[PDB]
Amino acid sequence: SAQKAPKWYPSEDVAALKKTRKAARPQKLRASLVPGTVLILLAGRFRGKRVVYLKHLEDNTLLISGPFKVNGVPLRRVNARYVIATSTKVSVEGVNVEKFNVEYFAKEIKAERVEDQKVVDKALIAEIKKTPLLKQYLSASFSLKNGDKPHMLKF
């Protein structure tokens, strides 16, 4: 004998977890996130792009569109904490977004996704074009200039 094996061994029976009192209540997103609001993307490959907010998804993500024709940002999910909600709003009455959901975004581009992008973009362009310089605003990327103070700036 090299170690004189112990008299008692711990049991290899994994005890069940006790019942957790944590219900998954719906997220209360801030009042600035209203569908149709123009958001500035703070991170990702499209960081700095100004996109249009759309249906709020069940995984707590925001469905956003560039529109793709305007600045090249497609219909895609985005985290609410990685966007700045500006005070510019386009009307989303007429854009049908009930189809898009977590399963729709679950993991070259699909022709279906191209077609829904075109369908949503048509209405988005129609709504944007009644506001002067709004298309140019959405085409231009947001950036901080020298002297910009985000704690004082309004969006």
Q: What is the contact surface with RNA in residues (CB under 7 A)?
A: 15-25, 28, 30, 59-60, 107
Residue closer to RNA by CB (options 133, 152) is 152
Cβ closest to RNA, residue 113 vs residue 135: 113
How far apart are CB 45 and RNA at their closest, in Å? 13
Give yes or no for a contact between 53 and 65, defined as CB atoms under 8 angstroms apart: no
Q: Where are the alpha helices (DSSP H) in the chain?
A: 68-71, 102-105, 111-128, 134-139
What φ, ψ does residue 15 adopt, rounded to 5°?
-75, 145
* Paired tokens of 84: 């700045």
Query: With respect to RNA, which residue has the nearer C-beta, 59 or 115?
Result: 59
Q: Min. distance of Cβ 66 from RNA in angstroms?
A: 21
40 - beta bridge partners?
50, 84
Q: What is the smallest separation between the CB atom of 5 and RNA, expressed in angstroms?
A: 21
